[PDB]
Amino acid sequence: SGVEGAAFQSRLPHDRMTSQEAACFPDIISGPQQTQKVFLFIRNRTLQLWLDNPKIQLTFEATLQQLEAPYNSDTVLVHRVHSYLERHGLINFGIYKRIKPLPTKKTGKVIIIGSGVSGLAAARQLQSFGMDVTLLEARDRVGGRVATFRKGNYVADLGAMVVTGLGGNPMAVVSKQVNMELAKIKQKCPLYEANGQAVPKEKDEMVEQEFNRLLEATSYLSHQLDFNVLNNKPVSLGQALEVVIQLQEKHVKDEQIEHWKKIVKTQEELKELLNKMVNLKEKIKELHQQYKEASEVKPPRDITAEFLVKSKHRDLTALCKEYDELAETQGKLEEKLQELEANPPSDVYLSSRDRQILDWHFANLEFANATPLSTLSLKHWDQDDDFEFTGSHLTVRNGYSCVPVALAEGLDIKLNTAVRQVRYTASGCEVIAVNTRSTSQTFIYKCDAVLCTLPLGVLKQQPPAVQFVPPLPEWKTSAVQRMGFGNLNKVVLCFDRVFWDPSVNLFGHVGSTTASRGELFLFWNLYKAPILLALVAGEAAGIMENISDDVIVGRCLAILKGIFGSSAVPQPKETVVSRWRADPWARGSYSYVAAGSSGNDYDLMAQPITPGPSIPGAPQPIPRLFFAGEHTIRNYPATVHGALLSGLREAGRIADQFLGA
């Protein structure tokens, strides 16, 4: 449906009020069901009108003229719902033409650290709400971990490149606001073992299925055997996979032992039968000789001599009958023993080639989580699974940077300004920063509130890149320690000609060892110009950062030469290698749910800091230091849409604090 689709596309249940809505409309959620339905329709219809045209501001008056009775009768209710949706960034977010030009009277002063997507989204909101906003950005560009390489006609993303499903995704609205050239990712992905030969379809499917079954198994291990702590430490996904694999190898050996034991049991039953026959044959042989002697006493004979012949005859035929039955049993046992000798259970759980192809699937998971599986929380690593958008994954053909650049239009952004210290007190805040080009140039920014969107990698840094005065409390620093911050890198290879399969967006390289499984394991064909992107994931990510570009590119060309032929792969005209762990403005790629962490740490990251009073005995201060970024949003961590959502959230929160709700 329509109003129902608007709710779904805003990540809202269409037939129920949320906790956020309960908080701003306690009168309605505690009141009769009929008014709740009226509220829900007003909300869903306002969402719909905005979604049906996100290029222009949806104003309260516009909304009301489009509502029809009975819903447009309580204009206070409509105005409340519209203001709520606007304040929380569910309508009139991103880049839209403004009906009412922005009032010149600004209220409050906010410094935003970082002009990645979260920082930029917050800034746009806060400026829309009438506040004075300045962003401080250490790099010489916007976008942060949205970072597009551009040279000539070559365009390639060094950070985020995939828009997940558009259904429920706020990047859907943005894509109608910005010229993004979105293109579906065909998920067909051939694998080539290290010898350049393709993985036979038989094997590609067997091992992928086993991969999925090993994952279900770890989840069974987690949820049914409560295998979540081992030797006083939290169990990891990788560690649980080891246990599962060991048990499948154990079961194969158990099965072999059971099988050969059936053969032993049968062999021994046969041995016992043969001994019985050998003795019976001898008894029969001796008995025959007796019957022979007695029958050669020639007639006429007395009746005892006759009885001797006739009773030896009788005894002999009975023993022969006994022997014939034992020989029938012998052929049945030799049958059973020939069937067993032909039904051997499996020899191995996984051959070497199998385990290599399996490692490719593990490397693929290490890519998606940007971290080795030995660091992922077994209990929680997939905790954002229930929030996946619907629809095909897509790439940004003209470079994802078009989004942050578009968001930056109109904002006051100081590039080349590295924040060094954040000061927050009951009367306001001071942010101290230096010019990255000449660090002696120092800058002081005073403001009512600081929105920190520094990456979790930067917050983790010891000794710190950024000092908080007073220091962040332990509940926040402990969360910063526990959370995972991973790593993932890309190699951009620009050629003058296409030598790969043009109708295939992915293909895999199956590394020879587990250690190296993440090293150049996946190649992407995503762009108009002949460009391949190669991924370095898992344990390889961090190690390959200490290897020169020429060696990394060499390894790439070697792999591709093996798959496509040595004469088919020219030298690249341009190459770029990312090193995100080493990037001091990132210190990694994106967060992961580490063993020992959980979804609640993302909530802790999002919680603002409130200073103590200046004068003792003075009233409770308001919060002063806010946080956004992909590490601050429990349900959509580690994505662009999660960062954007986190900025929208904080801007509503800050505006509620400093403008009133």
Added chain:
Amino acid sequence: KPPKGMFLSQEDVEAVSANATAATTVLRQLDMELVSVKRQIQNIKQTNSALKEKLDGGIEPYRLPEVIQKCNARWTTEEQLLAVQAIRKYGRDFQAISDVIGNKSVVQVKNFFVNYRRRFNIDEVLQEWEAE
């Protein structure tokens, strides 16, 4: 509720994780256990193969031809004397006694037991067969 064909008992999980090198120890002892079961199959095969070589020839040099005899209702003196010896040797095994005489049914044997019980001291003869 494990995936089909996956094997994951609580018992085994603890065995493979109770120790730092527990898993490899588990799979090692299973390997050696399979080696000693295969070793044992080799011995019994080779033992059975020697037994089969003794049964070469079956019992064919020793099987007598089977004669059918028309089952006659009348007892010659010779057939009575056979029966008494058959009783002496086989006891109440009416089938064996029939096979010795050749022309007397199991019922006729059993009836013989009663009719000549007195004249042939058949009770003495059964007692005689029981002493050995």
